[PDB]
Design an enzyme around this catalytic site. Structure first.
Site, short mmCIF file in Angstrom:
data_model
loop_
_atom_site.label_atom_id
_atom_site.label_comp_id
_atom_site.label_asym_id
_atom_site.label_seq_id
_atom_site.Cartn_x
_atom_site.Cartn_y
_atom_site.Cartn_z
N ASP A 2 0.83 -1.21 0.00
CA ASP A 2 0.00 0.00 0.00
C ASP A 2 0.86 1.26 0.00
OD1 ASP A 2 -2.91 -0.77 0.01
OD2 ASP A 2 -2.43 -1.82 1.83
N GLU B 134 -5.30 4.12 -0.48
CA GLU B 134 -4.14 3.26 -0.24
C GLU B 134 -3.40 3.72 1.01
OE1 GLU B 134 -4.63 0.68 -3.52
OE2 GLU B 134 -4.13 0.77 -1.40
N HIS C 3 -5.34 2.64 4.10
CA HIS C 3 -5.01 1.23 4.33
C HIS C 3 -3.69 1.09 5.09
CE1 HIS C 3 -7.41 0.14 0.44
NE2 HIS C 3 -8.19 0.59 1.41
N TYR D 1 -2.88 -0.47 9.07
CA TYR D 1 -2.02 -1.53 9.59
C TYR D 1 -1.25 -1.06 10.83
CZ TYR D 1 -3.02 -3.81 5.17
OH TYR D 1 -3.67 -4.40 4.11
N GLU E 145 -2.42 -5.33 -6.54
CA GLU E 145 -3.69 -5.18 -5.84
C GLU E 145 -4.55 -6.44 -5.89
OE1 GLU E 145 -3.48 -1.88 -4.71
OE2 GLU E 145 -4.63 -0.74 -6.26
N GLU F 227 -9.75 -2.86 -2.31
CA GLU F 227 -8.80 -3.42 -3.27
C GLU F 227 -9.52 -4.07 -4.43
OE1 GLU F 227 -4.95 -2.63 -1.44
OE2 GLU F 227 -6.44 -2.12 -2.98
N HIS G 76 -10.57 -1.36 -6.76
CA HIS G 76 -9.35 -0.81 -7.34
C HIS G 76 -8.87 -1.66 -8.51
CE1 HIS G 76 -8.04 1.51 -3.45
NE2 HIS G 76 -9.29 1.74 -3.80
FE LIG Z 1 -5.47 -0.78 -4.02
#
Ligand SMILES: [Fe+2]
Ligand SMILES: [Fe+2]
Ligand SMILES: [Mn+2]
Lengths: 285, 287
Positions: B62, B93, B96, B100, B161, B195, B198
Site C-alpha cells: 500500500d 491506499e 489502508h 495496519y 492489488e 482493493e 481498485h
Molecule cells: Fe489498491
C-alpha cells in the site's frame, strides 16, 4: 524498501495534518444548491458570465493540482508520512473540482456548461497561467530530481493554492457576503478551508527542503521564487482586468490578490511583498 | 488546457466508480482493535510472527501503490474523470497503510514494531517483489511515455492489488474465519472491499489502453504480461515457503495465490491460467 510506520514520527507535523485533513472530509452531495436559483436570476448577464468564468478557472486549478501537482511532488518525497498527507490532499482537490460541476448543474444548461469548458480550454491567459505552474511539475518527470527543482515545484504549488486561485474565490465570496448564491458559497468555504491547510503544509515541506540546500542554491531559488511571484502577478492583473472590468471590481480583486500573495509568501517562510480584505468578502467567509 | 467536466461523460464507468469509492470511505479510528488482545495471546509465537510479517508486507504494498503506483499512472492518463478516481484510490491506499499501524499499536510493543519495519525493509524477497513492480512505475518518470509503458504499469498495479497482496490477506482472513483477531479482520475486510474495486477499475483502463495499441505492441505486452505473471508467481511461492512453513499453511496459501492471480487476469480481460479452485472455506468464513 521502506513501508510507512506511523508508530515512529518522521516529523513533527504530518500526523496533525493527516488527522485534520480527515476531520475536514466532505463531498458535493452534502450541499444542496437549488435554492441559489432565486438569487442567480437576480444577477445580470455580465455578472453571471463572470461567475461562470471564475468557477471554470478554479476547476482548472484543482484539475491540475489533483492530477499533476500533488502526484509529482509526492512521488519524490522521502518522508512517507508526508507523502500520505499529500496523497489525501490530491484526492480532495478532485472533490473540489467535482463540486464546481455540481454548482454548474443547478445554474447552467448543458450547452452553457460546454461553453464554459470550451472557453477555459482556449483562454490564452488561463493557458499561460497554468502552463507556468505546470512547467515546474513537469521538471519532476525524471528519475532523479534536484532539491532545487522539488523546492520550486512546492513553491509553484503554494502559489497556486494560496495565491493564484484567489482572484477566483473573490467573486463567490463577494456575492455570498451579500446573501446571494449562499449555498454555492458554503461549498466554496469548504474548499477554501482545505486550500488553506494545503498551502500551509506544502509550505512547511518547502522550508524543510530549503534548509538542506547549499547557500548558492538557496540564493538561486530565492531569486526564482521572487520572479515567479511577480510573473504570475502580472498575468493575474491582466486576467482580473479581463474578467471584472464589466462589473466594476478590478481594483478590489487586485487588492485581494496582493493579500493572498502575501499569505503564500508567508506559508513559505518569506516576508510579504505587497503593502486588508474587502469587508464584504470577509462576510462571505 | 482542459478542466474536468463531470456534466459530460468521458467514459461509461468513472462516475459510478467515483461514487462507489466515496460511498465506501472509511478510516482506522472507526474500528477499535483492543478486544483482539484476548485471541492474540492464544496464538503461538510462530503464528504471531507470521501475522506481523504479512501485515508488514501488506503495508509495503500500500505504501508503494499510494506513493508511486497510482500517482504515476494517473499523471499520464488523458481521461480526467478516470484521473479523479485513481487519485481518490491512491489516498485510500494511504488509509489502508495507516490502518495496519493501528493494528500494530495494539498487538506489538514499540520495539517489536521497529523489528517488523526493519525486517520489511531488508527482506530480499519483498525487495525483489516490490522492485519488479515499481520498475514498471519508474519507467513513467519521463515527459512522454508510450502506451505500452502505461499499459504495463497498469498490469503491474492490477497484479499487486489483485494478486501479489493476497499471499498476505490469507492469514488475517484465515484467523478471523476461526474467531481469532476478528476486529483486525474487520479492518482487513474493509481494505479488501477497496482493493477489489481498485483492481477492477485499473483493469478496465488497462483494457481500454490495450485496444488503442498497434498489433505489434499488443503482441509485445501480451507476452510480457504472461511472463510477469509467472515471474511474480515464482517469487511468491518462495515467499510463501519462507513465511508459512513454520505454521503448516504453505500449500493452502499457494492455492489462494493462484485463485487471486486468476482474478487479476480476469480484471485485465484475460483468461485464467491456473486451475479453478474453490476458496479455502475457513478464509471464506473470514470474509
Ligand atoms: Fe489498491
Ligand atoms: Fe489544494
Ligand atoms: Mn485545490
Amino acid at each position: 524498501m521502506r513501508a510507512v510506520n506511523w508508530n515512529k514520527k518522521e516529523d513533527d507535523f504530518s500526523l496533525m495534518f493527516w488527522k485534520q485533513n480527515i476531520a475536514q472530509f466532505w463531498t458535493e452531495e452534502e450541499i444542496a444548491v437549488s435554492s441559489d436559483k432565486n438569487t442567480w436570476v437576480q444577477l445580470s448577464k455580465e455578472e453571471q458570465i463572470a461567475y461562470k468564468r471564475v468557477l471554470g478557472g478554479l476547476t482548472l486549478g484543482d484539475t491540475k493540482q489533483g492530477g499533476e501537482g500533488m502526484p509529482l511532488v509526492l512521488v519524490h518525497l522521502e518522508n512517507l508520512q508526508a507523502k500520505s498527507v499529500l496523497a489525501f490532499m490530491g484526492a480532495m482537490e478532485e472533490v473540489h473540482a467535482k463540486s464546481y460541476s455540481h454548482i454548474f448543474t443547478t445554474l447552467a444548461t448543458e450547452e452553457e456548461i460546454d461553453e464554459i469548458f470550451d472557453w477555459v480550454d482556449t483562454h490564452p491567459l488561463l493557458e499561460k497561467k497554468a502552463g507556468i505552474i505546470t512547467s515546474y511539475y513537469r521538471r519532476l518527470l525524471k528519475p532523479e530530481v534536484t532539491k532545487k527543482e522539488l523546492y520550486m515545484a512546492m513553491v509553484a504549488s503554494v502559489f497556486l493554492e494560496s495565491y493564484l486561485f484567489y482572484s477566483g474565490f473573490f467573486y463567490p465570496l463577494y456575492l455570498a457576503g451579500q446573501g446571494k448564491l449562499t449555498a454555492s458559497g458554503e461549498i466554496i468555504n469548504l474548499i477554501i478551508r482545505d486550500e488553506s491547510i494545503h498551502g500551509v503544509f506544502v509550505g512547511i515541506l518547502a522550508q524543510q527542503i530549503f534548509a538542506e540546500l547549499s547557500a548558492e542554491d538557496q540564493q538561486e531559488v530565492q531569486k526564482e521564487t521572487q520572479e515567479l511571484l511577480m510573473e504570475l502577478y502580472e498575468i493575474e492583473m491582466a486576467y482580473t482586468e479581463e474578467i471584472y472590468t464589466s462589473i466594476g471590481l478590478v481594483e478590489d480583486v487586485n487588492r485581494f490578490v496582493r493579500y493572498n500573495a502575501n499569505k503564500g509568501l508567508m506559508n513559505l517562510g518569506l516576508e510579504p511583498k505587497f503593502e486588508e480584505i474587502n469587508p464584504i468578502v470577509l462576510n462571505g467567509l
